[PDB]
Amino acid sequence: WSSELSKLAANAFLAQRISSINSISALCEATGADVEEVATAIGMDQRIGNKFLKASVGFGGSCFQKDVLNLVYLCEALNLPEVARYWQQVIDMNDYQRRRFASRIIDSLFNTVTDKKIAILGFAFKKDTGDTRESSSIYISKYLMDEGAHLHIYDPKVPREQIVVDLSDQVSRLVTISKDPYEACDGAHAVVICTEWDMFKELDYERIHKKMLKPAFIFDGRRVLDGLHNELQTIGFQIETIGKK
Amino acid sequence: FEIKKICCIGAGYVGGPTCSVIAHMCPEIRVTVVDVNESRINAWNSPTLPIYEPGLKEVVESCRGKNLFFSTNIDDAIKEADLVFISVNTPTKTYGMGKGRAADLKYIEACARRIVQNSNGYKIVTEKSTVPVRAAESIRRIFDANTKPNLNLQVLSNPEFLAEGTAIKDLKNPDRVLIGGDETPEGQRAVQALCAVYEHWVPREKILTTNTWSSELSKLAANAFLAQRISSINSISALCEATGADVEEVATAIGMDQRIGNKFLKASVGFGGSCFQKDVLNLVYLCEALNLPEVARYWQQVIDMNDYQRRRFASRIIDSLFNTVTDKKIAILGFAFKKDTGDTRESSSIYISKYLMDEGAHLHIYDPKVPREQIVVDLSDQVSRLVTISKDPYEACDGAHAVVICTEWDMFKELDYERIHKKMLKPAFIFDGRRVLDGLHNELQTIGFQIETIGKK
Amino acid sequence: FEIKKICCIGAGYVGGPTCSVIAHMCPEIRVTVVDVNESRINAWNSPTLPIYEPGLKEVVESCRGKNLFFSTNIDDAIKEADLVFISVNTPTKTYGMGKGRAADLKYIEACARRIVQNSNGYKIVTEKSTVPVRAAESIRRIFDANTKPNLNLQVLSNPEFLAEGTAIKDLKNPDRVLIGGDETPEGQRAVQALCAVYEHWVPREKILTTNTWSSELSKLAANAFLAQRISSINSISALCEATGADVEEVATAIGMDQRIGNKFLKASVGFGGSCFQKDVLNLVYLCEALNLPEVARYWQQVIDMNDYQRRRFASRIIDSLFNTVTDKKIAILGFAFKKDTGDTRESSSIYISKYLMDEGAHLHIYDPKVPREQIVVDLSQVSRLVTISKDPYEACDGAHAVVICTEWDMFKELDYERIHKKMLKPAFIFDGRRVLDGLHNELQTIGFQIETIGKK
Amino acid sequence: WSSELSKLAANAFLAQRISSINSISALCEATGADVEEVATAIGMDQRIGNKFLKASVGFGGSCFQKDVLNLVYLCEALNLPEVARYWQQVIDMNDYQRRRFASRIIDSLFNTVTDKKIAILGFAFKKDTGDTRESSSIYISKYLMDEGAHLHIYDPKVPREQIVVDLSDQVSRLVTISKDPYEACDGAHAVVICTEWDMFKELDYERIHKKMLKPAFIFDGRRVLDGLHNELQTIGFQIETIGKK
Ligand SMILES: O=C1CO[C@H](OP(=O)(O)OP(=O)(O)OC[C@H]2O[C@@H](n3ccc(=O)[nH]c3=O)[C@H](O)[C@@H]2O)[C@H](O)[C@H]1O
Numbered sequence A, D: 001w002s003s004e005l006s007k008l009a010a011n012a013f014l015a016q017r018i019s020s021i022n023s024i025s026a027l028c029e030a031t032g033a034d035v036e037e038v039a040t041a042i043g044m045d046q047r048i049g050n051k052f053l054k055a056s057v058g059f060g061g062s063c064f065q066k067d068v069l070n071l072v073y074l075c076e077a078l079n080l081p082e083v084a085r086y087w088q089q090v091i092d093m094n095d096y097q098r099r100r101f102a103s104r105i106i107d108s109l110f111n112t113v114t115d116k117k118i119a120i121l122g123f124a125f126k127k128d129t130g131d132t133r134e135s136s137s138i139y140i141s142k143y144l145m146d147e148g149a150h151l152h153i154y155d156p157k158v159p160r161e162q163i164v165v166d167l168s169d170q171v172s173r174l175v176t177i178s179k180d181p182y183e184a185c186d187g188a189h190a191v192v193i194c195t196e197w198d199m200f201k202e203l204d205y206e207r208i209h210k211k212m213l214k215p216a217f218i219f220d221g222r223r224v225l226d227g228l229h230n231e232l233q234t235i236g237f238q239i240e241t242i243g244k245k
Numbered sequence B: 001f002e003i004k005k006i007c008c009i010g011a012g013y014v015g016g017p018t019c020s021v022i023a024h025m026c027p028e029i030r031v032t033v034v035d036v037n038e039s040r041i042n043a044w045n046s047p048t049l050p051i052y053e054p055g056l057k058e059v060v061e062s063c064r065g066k067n068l069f070f071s072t073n074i075d076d077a078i079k080e081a082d083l084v085f086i087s088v089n090t091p092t093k094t095y096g097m098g099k100g101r102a103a104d105l106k107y108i109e110a111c112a113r114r115i116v117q118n119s120n121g122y123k124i125v126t127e128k129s130t131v132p133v134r135a136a137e138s139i140r141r142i143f144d145a146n147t148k149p150n151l152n153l154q155v156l157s158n159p160e161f162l163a164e165g166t167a168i169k170d171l172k173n174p175d176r177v178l179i180g181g182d183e184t185p186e187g188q189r190a191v192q193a194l195c196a197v198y199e200h201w202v203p204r205e206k207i208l209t210t211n212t213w214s215s216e217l218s219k220l221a222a223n224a225f226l227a228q229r230i231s232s233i234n235s236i237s238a239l240c241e242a243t244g245a246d247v248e249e250v251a252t253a254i255g256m257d258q259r260i261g262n263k264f265l266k267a268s269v270g271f272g273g274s275c276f277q278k279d280v281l282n283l284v285y286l287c288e289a290l291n292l293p294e295v296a297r298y299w300q301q302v303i304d305m306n307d308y309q310r311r312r313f314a315s316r317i318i319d320s321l322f323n324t325v326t327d328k329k330i331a332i333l334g335f336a337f338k339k340d341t342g343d344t345r346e347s348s349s350i351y352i353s354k355y356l357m358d359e360g361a362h363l364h365i366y367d368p369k370v371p372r373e374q375i376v377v378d379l380s381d382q383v384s385r386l387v388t389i390s391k392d393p394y395e396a397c398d399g400a401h402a403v404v405i406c407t408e409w410d411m412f413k414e415l416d417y418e419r420i421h422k423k424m425l426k427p428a429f430i431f432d433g434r435r436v437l438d439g440l441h442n443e444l445q446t447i448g449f450q451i452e453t454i455g456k457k
Numbered sequence C: 001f002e003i004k005k006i007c008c009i010g011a012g013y014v015g016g017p018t019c020s021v022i023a024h025m026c027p028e029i030r031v032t033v034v035d036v037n038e039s040r041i042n043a044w045n046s047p048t049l050p051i052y053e054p055g056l057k058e059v060v061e062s063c064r065g066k067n068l069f070f071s072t073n074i075d076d077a078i079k080e081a082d083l084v085f086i087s088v089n090t091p092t093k094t095y096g097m098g099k100g101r102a103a104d105l106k107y108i109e110a111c112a113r114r115i116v117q118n119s120n121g122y123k124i125v126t127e128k129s130t131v132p133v134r135a136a137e138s139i140r141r142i143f144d145a146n147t148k149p150n151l152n153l154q155v156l157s158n159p160e161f162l163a164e165g166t167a168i169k170d171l172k173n174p175d176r177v178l179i180g181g182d183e184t185p186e187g188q189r190a191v192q193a194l195c196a197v198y199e200h201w202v203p204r205e206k207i208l209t210t211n212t213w214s215s216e217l218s219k220l221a222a223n224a225f226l227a228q229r230i231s232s233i234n235s236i237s238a239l240c241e242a243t244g245a246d247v248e249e250v251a252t253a254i255g256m257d258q259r260i261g262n263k264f265l266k267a268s269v270g271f272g273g274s275c276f277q278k279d280v281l282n283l284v285y286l287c288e289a290l291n292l293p294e295v296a297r298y299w300q301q302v303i304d305m306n307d308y309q310r311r312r313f314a315s316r317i318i319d320s321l322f323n324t325v326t327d328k329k330i331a332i333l334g335f336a337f338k339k340d341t342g343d344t345r346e347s348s349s350i351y352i353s354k355y356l357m358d359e360g361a362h363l364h365i366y367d368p369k370v371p372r373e374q375i376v377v378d379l380s381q382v383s384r385l386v387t388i389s390k391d392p393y394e395a396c397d398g399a400h401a402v403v404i405c406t407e408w409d410m411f412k413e414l415d416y417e418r419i420h421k422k423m424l425k426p427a428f429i430f431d432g433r434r435v436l437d438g439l440h441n442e443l444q445t446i447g448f449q450i451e452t453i454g455k456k
């Protein structure tokens, strides 16, 4: 039991680190601070550590949410409701972060995305995997699909059939799986980066902007385009990223 | 800058009549109304206009083919225009954020993109609607993001205050004209150019100029104030019914206060139209986005009261008929949302009809101007079984248990109610939701009707 | 029937001015205003009237002692009257059913019983108030149950539409006169008699006659419609401050619609007065009693919005002072619920003051007409935190903020350069009435931070 | 246990009969029927029986409310919440009956009883006892005291000191204990009969009316003045009784 509880707790502590910094990212957006700068100051405390302080659209994977959900469930079964609602906030914050990002996209596109093309760059739950389990891209995609958006989804490693399954009628009408990222962005109103694949930092954003509809939005849900902000603004993109506004 | 050619995208209740009057008052300006809807444009070019507005036919026929034109060629109309009106529909969102509350700007945005694509040089682009909801701000962003060399588009807000059924009189003698534009030299140059158009027939002192947001918020607020006047008097009508007073007498006493005024104090089954509910819903939605929940719930009461008014009216009908109306014939006199229009959008007749259809009633609906096919659509198996559209009001009442007057058409007070009573089933009810059969109450009671009206018991 | 002698029980803001104007306009009618409050009656008989109403002193002094009399002898005034007005106060019930919501009819009933005791023959008894809540019905119930041989009391409803501060002009040129009486020959004879009084100066076409309940309901509704306009424009003022618009410009555009009208569209810290909140509260309470909860919650929003408007102004002041105002001096300019009156009943200044006192502020309150002792009573912590200033420069001397709560014309003419010199910095002006509009540039140049309702 | 459960149930069945007929009394008042006539028709069914069908201001005594409360509590402890709520209605209806009667008194007196004299005739929980435990007269008295009424209470058998105890500063200001019923009614606005003492049928109501304030109300919470309604109305009383209106 101590072995299992230790695993259950360690995963939940990690997921907390993400929800805590994601919560600060929302406060940063609301007050003119930059979550990456705040995270750096936080992480230099050796008692906190500097890992797992990368604000994001939200953590995914088959571990963290499942782990916290089971921790909450175990506590509820043990009549520890105070403990249950403590850890539940880790999930609620992750869900809020995804929802907040999705509605920021919708808000920027004039409160309406029906029949608008939107490129989704990144579908795996993190870079360097084909795993999509609990990927934030699924939730962001579903929020945009529920708003009538036509998604063009590119991921360098997730298989096409997996993406259709993850997003499943409505998938047939609204979801396209692209072979390359330039095809996903061709004629798009907005590009939403959901997974921090290194190849996204190196895309030809000059070429992408030319063939996008204007105003051309990039929604960087992973902070992967930091330092390109100047170059991207000069190209003419309106860049919105988590934890900065 | 002098506006000599006007293009209006949208040949509806706003765009059509507004541009027809401009052409009428500005003989030296060429006014071309365009629309994607070919059958609507064809009707504007025909002896039977696509909407019913008193005096509109006379105005259109004095101008059409001289300086007033109707065309489906949107692109070429834009290309030659000095001023482009955008008077398209903004339906309520049916899904997503603001489903059934926020309006859908997708047509405004599509028009803005089409204007830039088809424009060179200097043009003024003016959003004109009864409920402008961030319309000018959206057009501005598309434009700011889609520049061309030597393309110089100015965005104005110019809300339309006309009410349907009195559109022509309202357009020829507006209480005020409201124009919003940027507080820049170019914005003010654009504002003045549009003012110069209206100054052909509107005194300068009745033209208000402001910035674009203040123009749209004034319209949103003005619409909401009017809708409130109705919900307030309708709420008093419920109090009158409960206490033995007469809302029409109470309204007279209220309206003699010059600080309140005596207009828009006519209690009714409930306000309808494409403006008021949409306007308040969008105001509530706007206040929730700005974290003003107290303001949101303040204005929500205007809608809640209107919905209650309709429900209370319907349940009075059902109660009067012993709580069972299955297979009972009921005449619905009036389907338009007000008199002197064929427009049925958000008409209380729809809601009253639907409440009775849910009780299994056989409705026979007569309206002098709403097209039959429109009534069928508004009420849409159940419509096929339960709804009949009558070609005259005596056919609708023949064998009816009850006559429900939902629209204050003047012809309804002139009906031969002795003849109507003879062929109705007894007890024969008249439910007046427009307080129009007033002064006929003694006659109707002598004939043998049970008369029920809003705000009087 | 000809009314030659009028008695008015109640020498307040309604009874005093109304009867003074009647006497002024009807030199052949003897009008006696009576009251249990001897000091109030003494003031009416003095060079310093007990209420401040523009033009009232001139009206009173032209008639008093000729056909206008003020007396504490209620019983004898009733005995000789052809017409008895009842113009007493109806406080909100402080306990029981309708605590804080329902009007307390205890004084109307006591007046009705006293009238029966002291009456013989025929008299017209007319309830006159700004917020009549079943008043005529309760009087009639007493009269029906307390008959005497040859005693014939008729009950009319005659709501009073005057607004304080413009009472005299309103009474001499009313938009309409509303009289309710029974729909019987006796009731109609009484209605006509009262009409004949008003017809000395009011055209007949401006006199509405109806039954007693419709008369009272019309007043309840008319007051609520007015209060709703204020809450509506105040709600828009919050939306304006949140979106960069100016409620005064929006109000102008709205008010040019002749179906809306341009009156009562002045956004403010919130409406006050003994009428509006009481009226809406009683309307809500009435609707709940009639099982009209939808109507009740509709009108409740008028009060809820007014309360929020006050709370939002107070929190703007506290926020501007960086959320600590403990021991900070704040000038309150204006304590009356509107200009040109000394009346403070339900004044927003009370509520704003109390919010600041709850933050530990040291309030220095100046009002040109509200008596100092009234301000102390209204705010009763008062000893520790509240000072009543003799002039506005004393109130602002060393203040962090100046809060204008009442639109007294003198406030826009103050020497604001002098005021700024002696204030602590940053020096804020919080204009809760839009009275400093057009001075905004000058005040900013002087160095003030100006905050006003409906603008940011 | 079966003995104790049998007692708990029998009391609760009796208290239910009262709440059931009291509930019908409210319907009778609202629809123009007479609960006494309806009760007669009901009680002639030999399966219902004709006892304990006397509508009233509400049942009192140390048994019924305590019994139903304990039955409800027992059911809650046994995890029988459906049974608990079912029997709770017996108490809720009794409380509503008292409130409805009290507010009818206040309503008839123009919504205000401050400084008004109300005679309370009957304080025992039923006739022919000095017992006041859970007497409805206590609750009615407290409702009127909370509205500022000056109560003058007469009961032929309840000791003066018990009434003071049952109603307990506010008692000192508002409560008078009268030595005879004519003293209690002297100058009263209303007479509230809460206990069905047979002597209340035999009072000189002509004499009482002469000295009462007008309009003079009698609130018969026990139906003890039935058949005197014509004479009392001729004398000039406004008579309000439970289950008729
Ligand atoms: O800008 C603008 C666009 O919106 C509106 O025009 P509308 O064409 O909707 O017509 P309307 O006269 O207000 O009638 C609205 C509904 O209220 C109902 N209505 C109207 C007046 C009344 O007193 N009682 C009542 O029930 C009508 O019977 C109808 O159902 C603005 O008035 C206009 O200034």
Ligand SMILES: O=C1CO[C@H](OP(=O)(O)OP(=O)(O)OC[C@H]2O[C@@H](n3ccc(=O)[nH]c3=O)[C@H](O)[C@@H]2O)[C@H](O)[C@H]1O
Residues within 6 Å of the ligand: C130, C160, C161, C162, C163, C164, C165, C223, C226, C230, C263, C264, C265, C266, C267, C268, C270, C271, C272, C273, C274, C275, C276, C337, C338, C339
């Ligand atoms: O019958 C009657 C008795 O009740 C009322 O008279 P009042 O003496 O209460 O004066 P008032 O002019 O309405 O002002 C009320 C409050 O609203 C505030 N107020 C008034 C107008 C405005 O536009 N904005 C605003 O905030 C005032 O600043 C004040 O705080 C009826 O108007 C009268 O017809």
